[PDB]
Assembly symmetry: D2
Homo-oligomer: 292 residues x 4
């Protein structure tokens, strides 16, 4: 469907990346990475506010939105290298990156693994550090967090919506123990459920353990930690990451020799840029103002 | 590398493997089967067998890949360990048995409780069992990489499958050869570290299907502040979720927390170990 | 038709019995005189005990025949997350020890023949006199075999459709999608499609490499090699196992020290006991009587 | 000691380095910078100077770049990060940052697998065409869509690298490697192997290097002309294992996929050449290259 901004596409080589652009093209460039199942327009309201001071890019990752679906090719390194090419081909200037949930993991990915100087700093909006990994070095695994949702996506929707049993997913999700599962939406119609597979099966980040990535960040990192808790019935993690996982992540990025700003907001939803955009933008603008 | 012991050793052909074991007590007494911990031979129970033999017909066994039992490359799995013990109970014991297992042996004790042949078991004691903690993809709590993983990686890297590397010098640096380790096939550590030993045997299905009374002794455990890793066999969270699953299976789950005992209480504190065993064993 | 509800079973020529093997209940049928040499029949994947229905009537002249439903099939227990060659084989080990209670000659078709070989090498001592592996996918059913085609280049493509469109315990049951990607055959209605997952994902035999199994067989083995070929469009294996895989399986079994009989029937379907029962039972009885 | 990475020696050409972001890539350069650019990707265990002799000849016609991949030579060792996508994207950044011109990519062994990686997955316009010198298409995968798997070919070697050399030479038990190698080298610890991170072998043996990069999808999405040179290959009668880089079946299926992609696929069989023809027969290798490259 159409949205608040016109959409553009760029050939990154393997894929075509769809994205939207806002703000004076001379202002400092900002790159927004949506969450899993989220398209670029997940940031729609935030872009308008950020466009007052920033040149904002919001992108569809591969397997999402209008960007190419790439069966068997979904990995953190392929996601991140797509963004490396986007920065080098479209933006052509240093960027401040803001990523939400899985996008926040990719924001840290770029801070550590981008090409030199591509980034001035990254905002990781409620990122599932460790919690999104099958075998994390610290704390809950994906199977004890969002995994239950990813499983239902894998089984009832299938790669490239090959199954497409929406009713079956809703039933299983309503009977789930995961409140995120209990939580076709437009953003889901544009979503390649093989995303969920690689996360559930542990292949998306097999060659990209978070401990090595976080210990190699090279830019200032603003880490916002939203709602989190423990489910009594299952013991599973609620929210993006646990307090322990945030602690270990911070000590890793601190050891990397960068400035780590930890902004805990335990009463915010995991998509603050959508639920409380003014608060999200103020948090981002204040931190992004002191970078370079 | 094997040395003589205070008990005569016997061997039985289970089919794929030959299992070495030791026997103590009177055949008139209730039969008992002791499963050693990882890297432990049957004579890990030498101290406890003396006391238990007074009122029990005790059997202590070497699992495959340990002691004088067959080393089976590429065959180390919970189901293979457990069915080896099913065959030992059927061929050697030939009566109902109360099982006791330490650490990995404790996981195999819970295995028999759920997956043995009908009527083979009267009850199982899981001595400090790493429920979930020994898995690579546990349903609850720390994974093996956040607990005993680092030690398993050292066995895998410097000792190697069937001691194929045998870099004891490098192992100590990374961390003589203890007797129990000389009789130990380090491919044990690989299958645990790599998550293959229990791939077809997730603990939550195992624990949710136990069919006998279960005594769970939880020994020393904690968290390393520097890494957040698990110390001990399993965490309080994992012990809770294990008991909830076993309780749902419809069995009497007895739980004794001994926070000041080593993981091998039957060797470090045999009298205390036998005391907890005979007490619970007498109520079966 | 709803296989997920397990209300699909139909009557057959022989009465069905059930036994508690501990973890599972195993459904089976029985034919012949108990005083005769016992025979155990293992169906192919997607096949229930009654896959041998006709062959049972013929074999009952000479033998005491047991035909079993493996777990995940027929009326036997469905065990999510538990489907593995070692669990399949130890189910049969217990079936022999609890029900048959006598030495047996085992015949297994397709994956059942892999299990027949499994028993030859990994059963309890004296349980088996010999095994007939009817068109077994030696190596070809493994994700990472030591020889020749992998499962992804054989039955894998079919297993993938079973996994995706039927799903574990028929939880998806998208028969329309399956047909498009490719009513329900009765045998498939009795089939737990998690069978296909563990074969496609290579977890069924991870801890049971066929090379080590075949090299440790301890009974005479008869290996019938039915139709096989190469699909021109993909190069995939047609049939159970290639000639290269059969050759390597024979030398492994020969190295183990057992009497190997290789019976090539290249013009037979993979279910000869069902398509050509007389020929199948002829091959069985001739070989079984010479044990 | 290789674990300390204190093993490197001088070579015929000066060595340069570029920061690619995650890693620093060491490379050597030759030829007139005005001539068409060429990028040489060494084999597994091979450093840029595996092409030393070939560089002298190619430098007469092309602007040649020879690179040390990550985990090899003087480039960064990246524990737990070895994958085809990371190898390939390193080369994408190398072309973008250093060459800044379209390149013809020649790769040997795993390097040839990475050459096809770039043909399909590089940035638009980065490549003119690729030469895959005896590439283990499918044969280097753990779960290939066609033919032998790595466990049936070079797998046994990688297994020995993993067990006796270990990640980052952490084991450094070359003594045991020789023992085990003689029961599964011939010139002492080869210098190229002392510069090599054996975690390379682990990710290939364990099937993680290409878990997210199946060759079927890669070869089916090549976007440049491809020359596939096929050297010695056969079957060991005793074990049925694959000798060489890839079987004729795997070469056929690879060329069918690449043809479906719509590119020009050239296939040259050299059944008498070693897999490192660029090193064992530099003149013969450069003849094949120059003839096709023009």
């Amino acid at each position: 469907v159409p949205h608040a901004y016109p959409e553009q596409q760029v050939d990154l080589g393997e894929i075509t990346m769809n994205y939207a652009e806002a703000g004076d093209p001379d202002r400092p460039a900002v790159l927004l990475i949506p969450e899993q199942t989220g398209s670029w327009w997940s940031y729609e309201e935030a872009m308008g506010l950020l466009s007052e001071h920033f040149h904002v890019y919001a992108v569809d990752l591969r397997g999402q939105g209008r960007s190419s679906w790439t069966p068997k090719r979904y990995s953190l390194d392929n996601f991140g290298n797509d963004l490396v090419r986007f920065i080098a081909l479209v933006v052509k200037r240093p960027v401040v990156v803001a990523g939400n949930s899985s996008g926040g993991v990719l924001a840290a990915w770029l801070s550590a693994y981008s090409m030199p100087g591509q980034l001035r700093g990254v905002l990781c909006e409620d990122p599932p550090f460790f919690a999104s990994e099958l075998v994390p070095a610290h704390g809950h695994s994906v199977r004890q967090g969002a995994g239950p949702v990813f499983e239902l996506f894998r089984t009832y929707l299938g790669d490239q919506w090959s199954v497409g049993d929406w009713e079956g997913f809703c039933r299983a999700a309503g009977a789930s123990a995961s409140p995120m599962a209990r939580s076709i939406p437009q953003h889901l119609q544009e979503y390649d459920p093989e995303w969920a597979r690689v996360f559930y099966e542990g292949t998306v980040g097999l060659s990209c353990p978070h401990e090595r990535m976080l210990g190699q960040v090279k830019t200032p990192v603003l880490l916002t930690h939203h709602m989190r808790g423990i489910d009594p019935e299952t013991g599973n993690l609620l929210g993006a990451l646990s307090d322990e996982q945030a602690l270990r992540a911070r000590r890793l990025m601190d050891s990397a020799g960068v400035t780590v700003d930890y902004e805990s907001v335990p009463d915010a939803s995991y998509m603050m840029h959508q639920s409380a955009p003014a608060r999200y933008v103020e948090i981002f603008t204040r931190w992004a103002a002191a970078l370079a």
